[PDB]
Amino acid sequence: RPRFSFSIAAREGKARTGTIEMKRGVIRTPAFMPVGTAATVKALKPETVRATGADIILGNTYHLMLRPGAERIAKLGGLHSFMGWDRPILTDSGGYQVMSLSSLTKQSEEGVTFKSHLDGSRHMLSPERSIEIQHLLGSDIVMAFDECTPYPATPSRAASSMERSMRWAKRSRDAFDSRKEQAENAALFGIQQGSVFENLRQQSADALAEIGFDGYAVGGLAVGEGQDEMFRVLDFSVPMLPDDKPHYLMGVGKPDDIVGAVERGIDMFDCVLPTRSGRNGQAFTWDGPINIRNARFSEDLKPLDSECHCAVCQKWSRAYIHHLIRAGEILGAMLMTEHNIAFYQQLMQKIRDSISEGRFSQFAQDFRARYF
Amino acid sequence: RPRFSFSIAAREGKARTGTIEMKRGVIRTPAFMPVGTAATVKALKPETVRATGADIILGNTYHLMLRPGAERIAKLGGLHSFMGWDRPILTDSGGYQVMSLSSLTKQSEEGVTFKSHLDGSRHMLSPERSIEIQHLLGSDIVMAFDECTPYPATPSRAASSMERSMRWAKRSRDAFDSRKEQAENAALFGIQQGSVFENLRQQSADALAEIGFDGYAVGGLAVGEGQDEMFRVLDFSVPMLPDDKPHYLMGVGKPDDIVGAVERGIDMFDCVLPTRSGRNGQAFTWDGPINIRNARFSEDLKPLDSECHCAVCQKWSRAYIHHLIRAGEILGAMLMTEHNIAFYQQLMQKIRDSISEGRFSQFAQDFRARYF
Ligand SMILES: Nc1cc(N)c2c(=O)[nH][nH]c(=O)c2c1
Ligand SMILES: Nc1cc(N)c2c(=O)[nH][nH]c(=O)c2c1
Ligand SMILES: [Zn+2]
Ligand SMILES: [Zn+2]
């Protein structure tokens, strides 16, 4: 396969369905990427993640540079080898989690200096270091290092962050290209910023396209603005990005958000929702999510979802998983997670098929009628 | 298959190797039984437990009567159906864990009344109720309800507990037999008591044989007496039990204890060691156990054990599992547990094969030379 090749097979309105070919595998889009936090998709062996239908997973750069270490993972043969996942891996830049999880973050034009929320150590993450860490990890899709703008943002602050992000996008591009091995085997995605302001999003899109990237992510969303606002922003933002390249909506995972995002042109998604779902009792079903911990499921012999085809719904009942979760049993987490990720992948398959068949709009309608 | 049929295929000294045929499956002996505490073998799907080579698992009656409830499990179709394990299941009487984990235990000739260490509720466990609960669970091998004697024990107290246990063994037998369905489909094991005293063990063995059971367990050991004393007691105790029936050593699981116990006539074992091992970093190897959390394994690319054939040793390195455990990741527990249970099953296979081939004594010697 080629280093990177995105092809759209079918369309319906703004929605697209196709594939991304990379050296390590083919990615069917719209795609959902399970998140591997500390070099592991929570409570799941990589073979199980693949069994759910996943073509690609996301790796958190922030956690990896801290815990085992980027250099260490490289010495061990790369993240793929390390965790046992031989398919594509998209890695975030680490920046977003630096601003969310780390201590004493000192920001500058050069990058960001911060303290670990673990050992209390110190690191100087920058566009160059982030690209380098992602290289050390052996990432297939590398995200440009940016600065996520907090919501709500004033036009002036949103402009400054976006402008800095565009400058950092150029530095990310150059860092990526100067590393021969990485440029020849991996892909690079740029990230659009501009908060909720149309003019800023347009300037960001133009700057990104001018630099040139393999894919374009819509950043700065799913940060407290609500679905209506997110959709309103996506309405004008997605059309600004190059049509022939993948559109990636970062940190978006509620089923209804994904459906609406695909209707607006998004091809890729990632979220912790599925993994953190079965950690509190939340299991997704076609009739809406349910909290397995509720007493009404103590003697329910039916599977988590009536039509889901995952191994969990084939083999175990709600009653058993209810008991497992309430007992604080690890198997409870394993089973809940497998089902949830499988549910998401089935959602992505239903989306891809409906687009390919020109009945996506009807699917979106039927999905919402039942889900809500 | 028959309700119960034990047959010895080979012998070497006191050691035996054979099979127990039951309706739900064949059990190869000497056998190691993984422990399913809250209706789950910690961090493992039942298919994975079977993949390690396990022919049978143990179910904790104490935990089950408390958490989901015996009656509830029965209404749900039995423990086998509930947890997804269709092979034999041996259930303890619940008594031992009543004296170890529960609050305010009030003992009498009728049984034991106690408070739950969970909700703080109250229950009246007796030989009749224990047998009944095990029936409700759908147990294949039912353990008689006894009274484990604390170590050290005075001759007088050991005698009183043993005598009470023999009276409770008779009540267990009668309770079991009066329940047609249970008597026709399940097996009943009696438990020998008498502490470290030879005369008491002899009286217990005689009383048990007089009543008649499908199997005989050596109870009252692995309670703080040390390996030398345990072995010394087994030396004279095992020969007192019927030779043509299975000999079960309860709560014994260190690899060296199992080897020495088999040399003394034991056919069945169960222990939490394997499951609680990979919870602190302990992984068993042929060169002795290792603590995966130790910094020396951070960049060790070799598998947990060099010759182990489990899926974990085929797919992941010490370095990865070291990181997972130190990161508090669930997959760390899943991988450590699978390997440890697989190691135990391989130990049981090496024991069975060496007995069948008349070279067990040599195996025991070689095993210890390397393990220590
Ligand atoms: N919701 C979001 C999640 C993310 N991981 C990111 C990011 O990594 N970079 N930039 C972003 O804007 C962003 C937004
Ligand atoms: N070590 C032991 C573990 C056990 N689960 C038991 C038991 O269940 N009954 N009686 C016993 O003596 C005993 C001993
Ligand atoms: Zn399912
Ligand atoms: Zn192994």
Short mmCIF file of N, CA, C and O in Angstrom, two decimals, chain A residues 37-48 64 67-68 72 75-77 81-84 298-301 311-312 315-317 319-320 322-324 326-331 333-335 338, chain B residues 37-48 64 67-68 72 75-77 81-84 298-301 311-312 315-317 319-320 322-324 326-331 333-335 338:
data_model
loop_
_atom_site.label_atom_id
_atom_site.label_comp_id
_atom_site.label_asym_id
_atom_site.label_seq_id
_atom_site.Cartn_x
_atom_site.Cartn_y
_atom_site.Cartn_z
N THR A 37 -4.79 4.84 26.01
CA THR A 37 -4.17 5.83 26.88
C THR A 37 -2.71 5.54 27.24
O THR A 37 -1.80 6.18 26.72
N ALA A 38 -2.49 4.59 28.14
CA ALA A 38 -1.13 4.25 28.53
C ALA A 38 -0.63 3.05 27.72
O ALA A 38 -0.18 2.06 28.29
N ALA A 39 -0.67 3.18 26.40
CA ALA A 39 -0.25 2.11 25.47
C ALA A 39 -1.13 0.88 25.62
O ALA A 39 -0.67 -0.25 25.49
N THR A 40 -2.41 1.12 25.89
CA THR A 40 -3.40 0.06 26.05
C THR A 40 -4.80 0.62 25.91
O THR A 40 -5.08 1.73 26.36
N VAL A 41 -5.64 -0.11 25.19
CA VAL A 41 -7.04 0.27 25.05
C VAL A 41 -7.62 -0.41 26.29
O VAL A 41 -7.65 -1.64 26.38
N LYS A 42 -7.98 0.40 27.28
CA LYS A 42 -8.50 -0.06 28.57
C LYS A 42 -9.31 -1.35 28.64
O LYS A 42 -10.41 -1.44 28.10
N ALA A 43 -8.75 -2.33 29.35
CA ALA A 43 -9.37 -3.64 29.58
C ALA A 43 -9.56 -4.51 28.35
O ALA A 43 -10.37 -5.44 28.37
N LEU A 44 -8.80 -4.24 27.29
CA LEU A 44 -8.90 -5.01 26.06
C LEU A 44 -7.57 -5.38 25.42
O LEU A 44 -6.65 -4.56 25.33
N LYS A 45 -7.45 -6.64 25.01
CA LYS A 45 -6.27 -7.11 24.30
C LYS A 45 -6.43 -6.50 22.91
O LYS A 45 -7.56 -6.28 22.46
N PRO A 46 -5.32 -6.21 22.21
CA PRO A 46 -5.40 -5.61 20.87
C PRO A 46 -6.24 -6.46 19.91
O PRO A 46 -6.94 -5.92 19.05
N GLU A 47 -6.17 -7.78 20.05
CA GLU A 47 -6.94 -8.69 19.19
C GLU A 47 -8.44 -8.47 19.38
O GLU A 47 -9.21 -8.57 18.44
N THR A 48 -8.84 -8.13 20.61
CA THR A 48 -10.25 -7.88 20.90
C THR A 48 -10.69 -6.54 20.31
O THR A 48 -11.81 -6.41 19.82
N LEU A 64 2.25 8.77 27.23
CA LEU A 64 3.39 7.97 26.79
C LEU A 64 4.75 8.60 27.03
O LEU A 64 5.70 7.91 27.38
N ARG A 67 4.90 8.32 31.34
CA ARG A 67 5.03 6.98 31.90
C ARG A 67 6.16 6.11 31.34
O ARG A 67 7.25 6.07 31.94
N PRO A 68 5.93 5.39 30.22
CA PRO A 68 7.14 4.62 29.86
C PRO A 68 8.27 5.46 29.27
O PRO A 68 9.44 5.21 29.56
N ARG A 72 12.29 5.31 25.40
CA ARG A 72 12.25 3.92 25.86
C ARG A 72 11.43 3.06 24.91
O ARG A 72 11.85 1.96 24.55
N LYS A 75 13.38 2.37 21.86
CA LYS A 75 14.40 1.36 22.11
C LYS A 75 13.80 -0.04 22.16
O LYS A 75 14.46 -1.04 21.87
N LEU A 76 12.52 -0.10 22.54
CA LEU A 76 11.80 -1.36 22.64
C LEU A 76 11.20 -1.80 21.30
O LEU A 76 10.60 -2.86 21.21
N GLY A 77 11.36 -0.97 20.27
CA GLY A 77 10.85 -1.31 18.95
C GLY A 77 9.63 -0.57 18.44
O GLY A 77 9.10 -0.92 17.39
N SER A 81 4.85 -2.59 18.21
CA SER A 81 5.49 -3.78 18.74
C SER A 81 5.23 -3.90 20.25
O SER A 81 4.84 -4.96 20.75
N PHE A 82 5.45 -2.79 20.94
CA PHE A 82 5.28 -2.70 22.39
C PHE A 82 3.91 -3.17 22.89
O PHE A 82 3.84 -4.03 23.77
N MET A 83 2.84 -2.65 22.30
CA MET A 83 1.49 -3.02 22.72
C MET A 83 0.81 -4.17 21.96
O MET A 83 -0.22 -4.68 22.38
N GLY A 84 1.41 -4.59 20.85
CA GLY A 84 0.83 -5.68 20.08
C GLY A 84 -0.27 -5.30 19.09
O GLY A 84 -1.16 -6.10 18.83
N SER A 298 -30.73 -6.54 37.57
CA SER A 298 -30.23 -7.62 38.41
C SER A 298 -30.63 -9.03 37.98
O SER A 298 -29.90 -9.99 38.21
N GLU A 299 -31.80 -9.16 37.36
CA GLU A 299 -32.28 -10.46 36.91
C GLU A 299 -32.70 -10.43 35.45
O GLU A 299 -33.54 -11.23 35.01
N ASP A 300 -32.12 -9.50 34.70
CA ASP A 300 -32.41 -9.34 33.28
C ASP A 300 -31.51 -10.31 32.49
O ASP A 300 -30.30 -10.15 32.45
N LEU A 301 -32.13 -11.34 31.91
CA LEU A 301 -31.39 -12.34 31.15
C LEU A 301 -31.00 -11.92 29.73
O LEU A 301 -30.17 -12.58 29.10
N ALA A 311 -19.30 -10.35 20.93
CA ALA A 311 -19.16 -11.58 21.71
C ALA A 311 -19.84 -11.49 23.07
O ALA A 311 -20.38 -12.47 23.57
N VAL A 312 -19.82 -10.30 23.67
CA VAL A 312 -20.44 -10.09 24.98
C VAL A 312 -21.95 -10.34 24.94
O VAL A 312 -22.49 -11.05 25.80
N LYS A 315 -22.69 -14.11 24.52
CA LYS A 315 -22.42 -14.96 25.67
C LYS A 315 -22.93 -14.61 27.07
O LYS A 315 -23.19 -15.53 27.85
N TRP A 316 -23.06 -13.33 27.40
CA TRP A 316 -23.50 -12.94 28.75
C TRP A 316 -24.74 -12.05 28.86
O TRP A 316 -25.07 -11.30 27.94
N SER A 317 -25.41 -12.14 30.00
CA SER A 317 -26.62 -11.36 30.25
C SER A 317 -26.35 -10.05 30.99
O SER A 317 -25.29 -9.84 31.58
N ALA A 319 -27.88 -9.21 33.66
CA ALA A 319 -27.82 -9.63 35.06
C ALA A 319 -26.40 -9.94 35.51
O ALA A 319 -25.97 -9.50 36.59
N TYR A 320 -25.66 -10.69 34.69
CA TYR A 320 -24.28 -11.04 35.03
C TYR A 320 -23.34 -9.84 35.04
O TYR A 320 -22.51 -9.69 35.94
N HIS A 322 -24.24 -6.76 35.41
CA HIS A 322 -24.73 -5.89 36.47
C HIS A 322 -24.01 -6.29 37.75
O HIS A 322 -23.46 -5.45 38.46
N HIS A 323 -24.01 -7.60 38.03
CA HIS A 323 -23.35 -8.15 39.21
C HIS A 323 -21.85 -7.86 39.21
O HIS A 323 -21.29 -7.43 40.22
N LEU A 324 -21.21 -8.08 38.06
CA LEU A 324 -19.78 -7.86 37.89
C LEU A 324 -19.37 -6.41 38.15
O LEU A 324 -18.37 -6.15 38.83
N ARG A 326 -21.15 -4.09 39.84
CA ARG A 326 -21.42 -3.78 41.24
C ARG A 326 -20.45 -4.45 42.20
O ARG A 326 -20.20 -3.94 43.29
N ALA A 327 -19.84 -5.54 41.76
CA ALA A 327 -18.87 -6.26 42.58
C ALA A 327 -17.46 -5.68 42.39
O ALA A 327 -16.52 -6.11 43.04
N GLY A 328 -17.33 -4.73 41.47
CA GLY A 328 -16.04 -4.12 41.19
C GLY A 328 -15.09 -5.08 40.50
O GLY A 328 -13.87 -4.93 40.61
N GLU A 329 -15.64 -6.06 39.80
CA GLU A 329 -14.84 -7.06 39.09
C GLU A 329 -14.27 -6.59 37.75
O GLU A 329 -14.95 -5.96 36.96
N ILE A 330 -13.00 -6.91 37.52
CA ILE A 330 -12.30 -6.55 36.29
C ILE A 330 -13.03 -7.04 35.04
O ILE A 330 -13.11 -6.32 34.05
N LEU A 331 -13.58 -8.25 35.09
CA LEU A 331 -14.29 -8.80 33.94
C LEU A 331 -15.47 -7.90 33.58
O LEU A 331 -15.86 -7.82 32.41
N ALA A 333 -15.50 -4.67 33.63
CA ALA A 333 -14.92 -3.61 32.81
C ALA A 333 -14.56 -4.13 31.42
O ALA A 333 -14.79 -3.45 30.42
N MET A 334 -13.99 -5.34 31.36
CA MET A 334 -13.61 -5.97 30.10
C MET A 334 -14.82 -6.15 29.19
O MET A 334 -14.80 -5.76 28.03
N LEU A 335 -15.88 -6.72 29.74
CA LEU A 335 -17.11 -6.97 29.00
C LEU A 335 -17.85 -5.70 28.57
O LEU A 335 -18.34 -5.62 27.45
N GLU A 338 -15.68 -3.97 25.75
CA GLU A 338 -15.75 -4.68 24.47
C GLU A 338 -17.08 -4.38 23.79
O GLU A 338 -17.10 -4.05 22.60
N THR B 37 -14.00 -16.23 42.38
CA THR B 37 -14.52 -15.63 43.61
C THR B 37 -15.97 -15.14 43.50
O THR B 37 -16.88 -15.78 44.03
N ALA B 38 -16.18 -14.01 42.84
CA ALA B 38 -17.53 -13.48 42.71
C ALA B 38 -18.13 -13.91 41.36
O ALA B 38 -18.58 -13.07 40.59
N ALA B 39 -18.16 -15.22 41.12
CA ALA B 39 -18.67 -15.80 39.88
C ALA B 39 -17.84 -15.36 38.68
O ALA B 39 -18.36 -15.16 37.58
N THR B 40 -16.54 -15.22 38.91
CA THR B 40 -15.60 -14.82 37.87
C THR B 40 -14.18 -15.17 38.29
O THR B 40 -13.83 -15.05 39.47
N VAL B 41 -13.41 -15.71 37.35
CA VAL B 41 -12.01 -16.00 37.59
C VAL B 41 -11.39 -14.65 37.24
O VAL B 41 -11.41 -14.23 36.08
N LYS B 42 -10.94 -13.93 38.27
CA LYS B 42 -10.36 -12.59 38.15
C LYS B 42 -9.61 -12.21 36.87
O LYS B 42 -8.55 -12.76 36.57
N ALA B 43 -10.17 -11.23 36.16
CA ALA B 43 -9.59 -10.68 34.92
C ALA B 43 -9.52 -11.64 33.74
O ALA B 43 -8.75 -11.40 32.81
N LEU B 44 -10.33 -12.70 33.77
CA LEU B 44 -10.34 -13.68 32.68
C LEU B 44 -11.72 -14.13 32.23
O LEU B 44 -12.60 -14.40 33.05
N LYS B 45 -11.91 -14.17 30.91
CA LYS B 45 -13.15 -14.67 30.34
C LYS B 45 -13.04 -16.19 30.55
O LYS B 45 -11.93 -16.73 30.58
N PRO B 46 -14.18 -16.89 30.71
CA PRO B 46 -14.15 -18.34 30.91
C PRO B 46 -13.41 -19.08 29.78
O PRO B 46 -12.74 -20.08 30.03
N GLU B 47 -13.52 -18.57 28.56
CA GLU B 47 -12.85 -19.19 27.41
C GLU B 47 -11.34 -19.13 27.59
O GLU B 47 -10.63 -20.04 27.18
N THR B 48 -10.85 -18.06 28.22
CA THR B 48 -9.41 -17.91 28.46
C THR B 48 -8.95 -18.87 29.55
O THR B 48 -7.86 -19.42 29.49
N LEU B 64 -20.78 -15.82 46.90
CA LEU B 64 -21.97 -15.97 46.07
C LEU B 64 -23.29 -15.85 46.83
O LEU B 64 -24.24 -15.28 46.31
N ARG B 67 -23.20 -11.62 47.73
CA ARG B 67 -23.36 -10.72 46.60
C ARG B 67 -24.55 -10.96 45.68
O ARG B 67 -25.60 -10.33 45.86
N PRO B 68 -24.43 -11.86 44.67
CA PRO B 68 -25.68 -11.93 43.90
C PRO B 68 -26.80 -12.68 44.62
O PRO B 68 -27.97 -12.29 44.52
N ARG B 72 -31.05 -16.19 43.66
CA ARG B 72 -31.04 -15.37 42.45
C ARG B 72 -30.32 -16.08 41.31
O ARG B 72 -30.81 -16.11 40.18
N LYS B 75 -32.47 -18.74 39.95
CA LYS B 75 -33.52 -18.18 39.09
C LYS B 75 -32.98 -17.77 37.73
O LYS B 75 -33.70 -17.76 36.73
N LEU B 76 -31.69 -17.45 37.70
CA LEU B 76 -31.01 -17.04 36.48
C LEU B 76 -30.51 -18.24 35.66
O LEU B 76 -29.97 -18.06 34.58
N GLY B 77 -30.70 -19.45 36.19
CA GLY B 77 -30.28 -20.64 35.47
C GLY B 77 -29.07 -21.39 35.98
O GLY B 77 -28.61 -22.33 35.33
N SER B 81 -24.39 -21.27 33.70
CA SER B 81 -25.05 -20.41 32.73
C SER B 81 -24.72 -18.94 33.01
O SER B 81 -24.34 -18.18 32.10
N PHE B 82 -24.84 -18.57 34.27
CA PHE B 82 -24.59 -17.21 34.74
C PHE B 82 -23.21 -16.66 34.34
O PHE B 82 -23.12 -15.58 33.75
N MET B 83 -22.15 -17.41 34.62
CA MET B 83 -20.80 -16.96 34.30
C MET B 83 -20.22 -17.42 32.95
O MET B 83 -19.18 -16.92 32.52
N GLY B 84 -20.90 -18.34 32.28
CA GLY B 84 -20.41 -18.81 31.00
C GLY B 84 -19.36 -19.91 31.03
O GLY B 84 -18.52 -19.99 30.13
N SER B 298 12.05 -3.16 33.05
CA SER B 298 11.54 -2.03 32.26
C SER B 298 11.86 -2.09 30.77
O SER B 298 11.10 -1.57 29.95
N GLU B 299 12.99 -2.69 30.41
CA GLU B 299 13.38 -2.79 29.01
C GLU B 299 13.72 -4.22 28.62
O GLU B 299 14.49 -4.47 27.69
N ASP B 300 13.13 -5.18 29.35
CA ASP B 300 13.35 -6.60 29.10
C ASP B 300 12.36 -7.04 28.01
O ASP B 300 11.15 -7.08 28.22
N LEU B 301 12.89 -7.35 26.83
CA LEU B 301 12.08 -7.78 25.70
C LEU B 301 11.62 -9.24 25.74
O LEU B 301 10.73 -9.63 24.98
N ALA B 311 -0.49 -17.61 25.56
CA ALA B 311 -0.64 -16.52 24.60
C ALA B 311 0.11 -15.26 25.02
O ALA B 311 0.65 -14.54 24.17
N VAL B 312 0.19 -15.02 26.32
CA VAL B 312 0.89 -13.84 26.83
C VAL B 312 2.38 -13.87 26.50
O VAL B 312 2.94 -12.88 26.01
N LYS B 315 2.93 -13.29 22.72
CA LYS B 315 2.69 -11.94 22.23
C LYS B 315 3.30 -10.71 22.91
O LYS B 315 3.56 -9.72 22.23
N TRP B 316 3.50 -10.74 24.23
CA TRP B 316 4.04 -9.57 24.93
C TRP B 316 5.31 -9.77 25.75
O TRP B 316 5.62 -10.87 26.21
N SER B 317 6.05 -8.68 25.93
CA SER B 317 7.30 -8.70 26.68
C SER B 317 7.14 -8.33 28.15
O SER B 317 6.12 -7.78 28.57
N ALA B 319 8.85 -6.07 29.60
CA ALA B 319 8.86 -4.60 29.57
C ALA B 319 7.46 -4.02 29.47
O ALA B 319 7.11 -3.09 30.21
N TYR B 320 6.64 -4.57 28.58
CA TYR B 320 5.27 -4.09 28.41
C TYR B 320 4.38 -4.37 29.62
O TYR B 320 3.61 -3.50 30.06
N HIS B 322 5.44 -4.89 32.63
CA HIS B 322 6.03 -4.13 33.73
C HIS B 322 5.36 -2.75 33.72
O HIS B 322 4.89 -2.28 34.76
N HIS B 323 5.32 -2.13 32.55
CA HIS B 323 4.71 -0.82 32.37
C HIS B 323 3.22 -0.83 32.74
O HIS B 323 2.74 0.05 33.45
N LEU B 324 2.51 -1.85 32.26
CA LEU B 324 1.08 -2.01 32.50
C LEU B 324 0.75 -2.13 33.99
O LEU B 324 -0.19 -1.51 34.48
N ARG B 326 2.73 -1.22 36.57
CA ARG B 326 3.10 0.02 37.23
C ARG B 326 2.15 1.18 36.91
O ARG B 326 1.99 2.09 37.71
N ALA B 327 1.47 1.08 35.77
CA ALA B 327 0.52 2.10 35.36
C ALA B 327 -0.87 1.82 35.94
O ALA B 327 -1.80 2.61 35.76
N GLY B 328 -1.01 0.69 36.62
CA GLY B 328 -2.29 0.31 37.21
C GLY B 328 -3.32 -0.05 36.16
O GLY B 328 -4.52 0.07 36.39
N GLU B 329 -2.86 -0.48 34.99
CA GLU B 329 -3.74 -0.86 33.88
C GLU B 329 -4.37 -2.24 34.01
O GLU B 329 -3.70 -3.21 34.36
N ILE B 330 -5.66 -2.32 33.71
CA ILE B 330 -6.41 -3.57 33.77
C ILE B 330 -5.78 -4.67 32.92
O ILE B 330 -5.72 -5.83 33.34
N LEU B 331 -5.29 -4.32 31.73
CA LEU B 331 -4.66 -5.30 30.85
C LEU B 331 -3.47 -5.95 31.55
O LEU B 331 -3.15 -7.11 31.29
N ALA B 333 -3.29 -6.78 34.67
CA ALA B 333 -3.87 -7.84 35.50
C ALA B 333 -4.34 -9.02 34.64
O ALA B 333 -4.14 -10.17 35.01
N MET B 334 -4.96 -8.71 33.51
CA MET B 334 -5.44 -9.74 32.58
C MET B 334 -4.29 -10.62 32.09
O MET B 334 -4.36 -11.84 32.15
N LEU B 335 -3.23 -9.98 31.63
CA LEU B 335 -2.06 -10.68 31.11
C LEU B 335 -1.29 -11.47 32.18
O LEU B 335 -0.87 -12.59 31.93
N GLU B 338 -3.55 -14.56 33.21
CA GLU B 338 -3.58 -15.59 32.18
C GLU B 338 -2.28 -16.39 32.20
O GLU B 338 -2.31 -17.62 32.19
#
